[PDB]
Design a protein around this ligand. Structure first.
Ligand code: CDL
Ligand code: CDL
Ligand code: U10
Ligand code: PC1
Ligand code: PC1
Ligand code: 3PE
Ligand code: 3PE
Ligand code: HEM
Ligand code: HEM
Ligand code: HEM
Ligand code: FES
Lengths: 239, 56, 98, 74, 52, 65, 379, 32, 54, 54, 54, 51
């Protein structure tokens, strides 16, 4: 059996009040679009959420119209195909779950809208997983089609190696090293799971400050109004 | 004493107490929000969208 | 001897720290509720002031100075006779009910 | 149950001071720290032992489990 | 709510409580503009206005 | 192109925890291979080796990235 | 002519319940949790309503609705995680409240104690349905397991289980009825909490010492009201730390996978606040015996006023009994951890001993010990 | 007797302003 | 059901090739982490062409 | 109140939520109604006080 | 199910494919009508016999 | 407790046993009637026509 747990990587957003590197989010979206979107899906995230996080409005619009998304029945009686816009969720790669299972070896690529909030370990898992591919150890013979990943439960993941060195060209020009690609995609997936990650932390900061201020004064109020009982100095004078 | 003048001026009347509290909150929200946003952007510099907007 | 463990438990109980002599810590059931009532005036007043002191100390989370900790050998059982009489009367009443 | 039908009490004198002349934090640390140390001394020997034996039981279970999950000569 | 409430003592009492009631209304107005974040007042204000 | 992942992998494999983890690994492999029909797997030794390597690797790598 | 505080018929109860209520002078912080429960309930009512604002209790859209709350609605994530962590914190304060009641001999108050037991039952049922609502993998599978536990009841087992399910398995009907039940029950809890306070007010309160404080009562308003506010602020501190720095710290990530009735998750552990009974349920090999032990674990609180024999009301002055009580608390923690762990060699036997000792302390060890110091203190 | 009783000294708890027996608390009442 | 067979495999009828607990011709798992064999319902073969199941 | 630009999803869901909660508020206010009524007693058709005939 | 794509379908489901569900649904609607009938009669009684003096 | 048993309580029990037992009979009949326990109604003359 055994379950090799993912080591705790020192992510930039790991800090108590540290938010994700949004430039890393911009880089991590491209790998999802050009690599992970080929078989996987992010159905719960639309192009609208992308603006203001790692893209501006015009780039988001252009990116959305790059793909083609289905709209409702036209005035003739059938589906009419239209380019995407801001209010369209990320395109599904496969028409239905059955098509997804059949197209692959027989497994199902889980949607990544929550894969970081569903896997025990979080980003440290996924990153390590994408970088955990290796030759199976002696005495283990995986079936044709199965690939060996120690971090995957059962060590028999049905995933072709998704990330290899120089898989795609980052627009800004950062090197396409597999480690960089995996790091950026993991940050992007964490953002996808927890979009409020920035604001939450920001809110927490304020909660730390004012409750560091309210708590003494309120306490200072209590000891103020409770001091009468705390300095009673009783006396007994029986006859 | 400054505290004594403060109390004799705008703390004796409970209604003036409320006015002081409200006008104080008016500026406290502003100052605290500015300061906390300042601390947050200083801690996370070069990572927030505001800091990297100018590139694109 | 057995008195050794009795004294050890008395010191470990902690009500001697607050000035209470055993009987002041009694759970007030009906029989006890009568037992306090039957007490003479002086004993009742002393008990009520003593409990007042304990409540004050517990509110302040303090104890008496070491000197005024009621000794084991000085713990007078002012309620045992009255409470025992109440219990005997209750037993007789129940027996007549039978 | 309201104030007045509560008890009978006699010869008890209670003094007090207003909250506006007594410092709300009178020698906070100076007397608080010995007080907290005394309170901790009173109860540590009767509070901690069950928790430490729980800790031992928990850690022991953790390894015993993962050893049971280890290999075996054959 | 009739001639009973109209009288010199009642008028004087009105005068006595006019400052308190009026600045209570001022308290209410300030609280309202604060809570609602009313721009049409807050724009004219000093430093506060920099929020927008 | 050179990935920093492989570099950090090697310089962390030089650690002595990884040294003895590897020792048990090559002790397991021929023990399993020579045994023609055994049903043992060296997955446990590989798991300990990977744990020892990866906890170390996490400390490095991200600085280079 | 008369103070409106004590003249207005509606103001009478409020004044006699929170303003001029005679309270013990030496009340410790352990009693503040009484407020912390009630206030917390309001947040659960306040937040839980807003979750009900945007929620379609339907198998095909419940999870989508929850994600839309946490991702699209303005500050919906705040409300959602505030609600969940508030429920967890509510159970924290409930356990601390029961512990305080056990310690300072409050179960002498009988009617309040039984009403509190009913409150506990209702709150646990409410939390169960609430965890069912998100319709994640753990939601659906834990609901299936816990409702299948009812099959152990003889004769009427299967029909009762199918009745609760609303069909043949946990599906549309089960979720739809669970949402409405989760809506109604907290109002029952509120009315029952009003009854709890009504019963309590007639006997005052139990101070830590345990002796009657009828002669040292103090007005409630300038006092604990402010102390209760301070306690509520500390509670808000803990809750806000939980929500704002690690929302899913107390929660299994597997719930974020949509509920698929084809894949059993690797672990079927319920929420953190139920394992203490769940572990007991795992301990007894017999299914019916397991269910009876599970229910009796909570029901044992009712027997507590009967089992008390020490002539002192409170635990302040009973050292050996205090060691026993802290052993009980350690046992509860051990049971929670065991319920967290799977059913394997090292954990089965530990669960057996934990359950046995947890029952033994309450039934045998505590009263037998209570005899001992009574004999020790010459009475 | 009523003459015999007296208020125990509170000097340990008093604020700095109202601590001497010759000054008047009216002066520092506003400050406190 | 890690990328399983469709009533095929080495072990007659069914066989899990991802993990252990290889299925049988009747579905029995050979040895591994599968809690049980292929799930079996309450079939009712009270007549031909019927075999009522759940 | 709409939750959007027209009576739509949010309006229906929130109307369900409010329609669920409110009748319990009705119950509370009805209890207070009875509480207030008891302090004077019901009014007979004749209007005049019937304290000698209760 | 308070959703604009299943609300009407769910109501039809209650009326049609639920054991004695039509009774519950029509009991609800006509009970609302009768509740308002009783409320109006109650308000009229209060107006007539001068119960607003309370 | 020891407050129970004894002379008086046993004839109290004897006095109240018919009433309590036949109240339990009332409860049994009410339960079988409300729940329509087919098992019991199999052995009553009229009500076999239900099934
Ligand atoms: C989980 C759910 C949430 C749980 C928390 C909320 C519920 C409980 C709320 C309790 C409450 O409101 O007051 C409790 C309790 C009531 O007693 P108190 O008002 O502190 O007065 C002192 C005691 O009489 C005891 O006095 P003493 O003998 O310890 O000496 C005086 C004093 C001085 O001792 C100290 O200050 C301790 C030394 C370290 C500081 O003691 C304290 O201040 C003890 C409190 C800890 C500080 O107050 C506190 O615990 C104070 C708040 C915590 C410290 C300040 C944080 C800012
Ligand atoms: C150094 C390590 C910590 C101190 C030593 C603790 C220890 O071993 O025994 C506690 C030691 C002996 O217990 P004790 O003084 O007889 O307890 C008096 C009251 O029953 C319990 O204390 P209390 O009700 O007189 O005063 C409130 C007290 C304790 O407050 C609580 O225990 C409730 C709030 C805390 C969260 C609940 C879980 C703990 O609060 C604090 O001590 C610090 C502030 C806690 C949050 C705000 C309240 O007491 C203290 O150190 C202070 C109170 C316990 C703090 C924990
Ligand atoms: C020392 O005793 C006490 C306290 O604090 C230690 C208290 O705080 C309070 C006061 C407590 C509360 C006001 C909160 C708890 C009460 C309830 C949940 C009862 C229902 C009444 C409400 C106003 C709350 C719910 C309201 C709505 C849904 C009481 C009574 C008390 O007895
Ligand atoms: C009535 C008191 C003013 C309320 C108000 O609109 O305040 C301005 C603020 C902010 O808006 P505003 O500052 O743009 O003023 C209102 C502008 N119109 C009329 C076009 C909407 O209002 C709100 O935040 C909510 C309005 C309703 C409050 C009740
Ligand atoms: C929705 C809201 C509205 C619901 C409907 C409201 C309108 C109908 C209300 C009920 C009808 C009136 C009361 C009927 C009951 C009655 O007579 O009560 C008083 C009666 C008393 O009436 P009595 O005093 O004339 O007769 C009893 C006295 N002796 C014996 C001397 C004759 O209550 C009882 O008799 C109580 C015991 C028997 C009834 C309870 C158990 C019966 C079996 C139940 C089924 C099995 C379980
Ligand atoms: C960790 C759990 C305990 C946290 C608080 C620390 C503690 O227990 O301190 C000891 C304290 C002593 O209480 P006290 O009544 O003063 O004891 C007199 C002894 N002669 O103990 C107490 O006050 C006992 C409180 C018991 C109820 C709350 C804690 C248990 C909750 C279980 C759920
Ligand atoms: C019923 C229709 C018949 C009716 O109301 O007849 C009048 C009758 C008068 O009864 P009484 O007041 O005893 O007569 C005194 C005469 N000197 O009875 C009455 O006047 C009694 C009824 C008075 C009004 C009761 C409230 C309901 C009125 C009808 C619905 C109104 C709804 C709209 C207003 C609210
Ligand atoms: C007794 C107090 C309450 C407790 C302990 C409680 C507990 C819970 C819990 C644990 C969940 C699961 C949350 C999650 O897994 O993310 C939940 C969900 C929910 N609760 Fe409550 N709840 C309470 C009161 C209420 C009330 C009064 C309402 C309705 C007004 C409500 C509405 C909901 C809804 C709609 C959900 C589903 C959305 C979600 O998962 O958060 N709750 N509840
Ligand atoms: C719905 C959750 C509950 C609420 C809102 C609630 C409310 C309260 C409040 C406000 C108090 C007074 C403060 C205090 O003494 O702590 C109190 C006291 C008490 N409650 Fe609860 N309670 C709840 C659950 C319980 C439970 C589960 C029990 C135990 C079965 C219980 C038994 C008691 C007892 C015995 C007291 C008296 C404590 C004392 O004064 O010494 N309650 N309750
Ligand atoms: C939520 C619905 C209501 C309930 C459950 C309710 C409940 C009651 C009940 C049970 C009574 C005593 C029986 C009676 O005298 O009729 C009563 C009396 C009364 N109610 Fe209501 N009521 C409701 C609505 C109203 C309304 C809308 C009004 C008018 C604004 C009103 C005003 C009164 C008055 C004036 C009385 C005294 C009648 C008398 O003295 O003769 N109630 N209410
Ligand atoms: S893949 Fe068929 S269950 Fe293992």
């Amino acid at each position: 059996d055994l379950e090799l747990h993912a080591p705790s990587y020192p992510w930039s957003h790991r800090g108590l009040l540290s938010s994700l590197d949004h430039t890393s989010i911009r880089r991590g979206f491209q790998v999802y679009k050009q690599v992970c979107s080929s078989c996987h899906s992010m159905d719960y995230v639309a192009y609208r959420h992308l603006v203001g996080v790692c893209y501006t409005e015009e780039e988001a619009k252009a990116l959305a119209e790059e793909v083609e998304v289905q709209d409702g029945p036209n005035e003739d009686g059938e589906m009419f195909m239209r380019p995407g816009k801001l209010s369209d969720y990320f395109p599904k790669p496969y028409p239905n779950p059955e098509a997804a299972r059949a197209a692959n070896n027989g497994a199902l690529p889980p949607d990544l809208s929550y894969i970081v909030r569903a896997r025990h370990g979080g980003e440290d898992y996924v990153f390590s997983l994408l970088t955990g591919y290796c030759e199976p150890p002696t005495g283990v013979s995986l079936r044709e089609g199965l690939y060996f990943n120690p971090y995957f439960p059962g060590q028999a993941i049905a995933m072709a190696p998704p990330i290899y060195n120089e898989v795609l060209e980052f627009d800004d020009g950062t090197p396409a090293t597999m480690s960089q690609v995996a790091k950026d995609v993991c940050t992007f997936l964490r953002w996808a799971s927890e979009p409020e990650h920035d604001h939450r932390k920001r809110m927490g900061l304020k909660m730390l400050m004012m409750m560091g201020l309210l708590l003494p004064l309120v306490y200072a109020m209590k000891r103020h109004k409770w001091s009468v009982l705390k300095s009673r100095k009783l006396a007994y004078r029986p006859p | 004493t400054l505290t004594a003048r403060l109390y004799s001026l705008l703390f004796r009347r409970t209604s003036t107490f409320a006015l002081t509290i409200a006008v104080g909150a008016l500026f406290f929200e502003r100052a605290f929000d500015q300061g906390a946003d300042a601390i947050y952007e200083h801690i996370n510099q070069g990572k927030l969208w505001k800091h990297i907007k100018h590139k694109y | 001897w057995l008195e050794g463990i009795r004294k050890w438990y008395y010191n470990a109980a902690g009500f001697n720290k607050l000035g209470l002599m055993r009987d002041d810590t009694i759970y007030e059931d009906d029989d006890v509720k009568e037992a306090i009532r039957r007490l003479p005036e002086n004993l009742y007043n002393d008990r009520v002031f003593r409990i007042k002191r304990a409540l004050d100390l517990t509110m302040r989370q303090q104890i008496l100075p070491k000197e005024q900790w009621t000794k084991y050998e000085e713990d007078k059982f002012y309620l045992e006779p009255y409470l025992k009489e109440v219990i005997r009367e209750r037993k007789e009443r129940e027996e007549w009910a039978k | 149950r309201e104030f007045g039908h509560l008890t009978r009490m006699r010869h008890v004198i209670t003094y007090s001071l207003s909250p506006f002349e007594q410092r709300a934090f009178p020698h906070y640390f100076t007397k608080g720290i010995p007080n907290v140390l005394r309170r901790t001394r009173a109860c540590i020997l009767r509070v901690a032992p069950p928790f430490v034996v729980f800790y031992l039981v928990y850690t022991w279970g953790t390894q015993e489990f993962e050893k049971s999950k280890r290999k075996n000569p054959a | 709510m009739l001639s009973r409430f109209l009288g010199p003592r009642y008028r004087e009492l009105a005068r006595n409580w006019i400052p308190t009631a009026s600045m209570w209304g001022a308290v209410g107005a300030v609280g309202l503009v604060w809570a609602t974040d009313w721009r049409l007042i807050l724009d004219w204000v000093p430093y506060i206005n920099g929020k927008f | 192109l050179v990935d920093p992942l492989t570099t950090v992998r090697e310089q962390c494999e030089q650690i002595e925890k990884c040294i003895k983890a590897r020792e048990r690994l090559e002790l397991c492999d021929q023990r399993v291979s020579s045994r023609s029909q055994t049903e043992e797997d060296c997955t446990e030794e590989l798991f300990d080796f990977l744990h020892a390597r990866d906890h170390c690797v996490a400390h490095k790598l991200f600085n280079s990235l | 002519m008369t103070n409106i505080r004590k003249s207005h018929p509606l103001m009478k109860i409020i004044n006699n319940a929170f303003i001029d209520l005679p309270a013990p002078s030496n009340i410790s912080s352990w009693w503040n949790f009484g407020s912390l429960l009630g206030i917390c309930l309001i947040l659960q009512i306040l937040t839980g309503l807003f979750l009900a604002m945007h929620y379609t209790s339907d198998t095909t859209t419940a999870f989508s609705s929850v994600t839309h709350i946490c991702r699209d609605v303005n500050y919906g994530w705040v409300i959602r995680y505030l609600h969940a962590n508030g429920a967890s914190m509510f159970f924290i304060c409930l356990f601390i409240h029961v512990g305080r009641g056990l310690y300072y001999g409050s179960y002498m108050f009988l009617e309040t104690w039984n009403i509190g037991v009913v409150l506990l039952f209702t709150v646990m049922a409410t939390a169960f349905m609430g965890y069912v609502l998100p319709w994640g993998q753990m939601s659906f599978w834990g609901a299936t397991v816990i409702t299948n536990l009812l099959s152990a009841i003889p004769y009427i087992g299967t029909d009762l289980v199918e009745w609760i399910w609303g069909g043949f398995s946990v599906d549309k009907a089960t979720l739809t009825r669970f949402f409405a039940f989760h809506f109604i029950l907290p109002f029952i809890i509120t009315a029952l909490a009003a009854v709890h306070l009504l019963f309590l007010h007639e006997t005052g309160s139990n101070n830590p010492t345990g002796i009657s404080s009828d002669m040292d009562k103090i007005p409630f308003h300038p006092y604990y009201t402010i102390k209760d506010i301070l306690g509520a602020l500390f509670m808000m501190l803990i809750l806000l730390i939980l929500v704002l720095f690690s929302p899913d710290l107390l929660g299994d990530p597997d719930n974020y996978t949509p509920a698929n009735p084809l894949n059993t998750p690797p672990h079927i552990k319920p929420e953190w606040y139920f394992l203490f009974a769940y572990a007991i349920l795992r301990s007894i090999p017999n299914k019916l015996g397991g269910v009876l032990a599970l229910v009796a674990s909570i029901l044992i609180l009712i027997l507590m006023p009967m089992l008390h024999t020490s002539k002192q009301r409170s635990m302040m002055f009973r050292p050996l009994s205090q060691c026993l009580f802290w052993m009980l608390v350690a046992d509860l923690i051990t049971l929670t951890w065991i319920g967290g762990q799977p059913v394997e060699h090292p954990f089965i036997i530990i669960g057996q001993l934990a359950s046995i000792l947890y029952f033994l302390i309450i039934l045998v060890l505590m009263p037998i010990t209570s005899i001992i110091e009574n004999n020790l203190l010459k009475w | 007797s009523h003459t015999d009783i007296r208020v125990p000294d509170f000097s340990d708890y008093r604020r700095a302003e109202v601590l001497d027996s010759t000054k008047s608390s009216k002066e520092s009442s506003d400050a406190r | 059901g890690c990328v399983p067979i469709a009533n095929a495999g080495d072990f007659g009828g069914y066989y899990c090739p991802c993990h252990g607990s290889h299925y049988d011709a009747s579905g029995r798992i050979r040895k591994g982490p599968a809690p049980l064999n292929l799930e079996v319902p309450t079939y009712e073969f009270t007549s031909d062409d019927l075999v009522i199941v759940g």
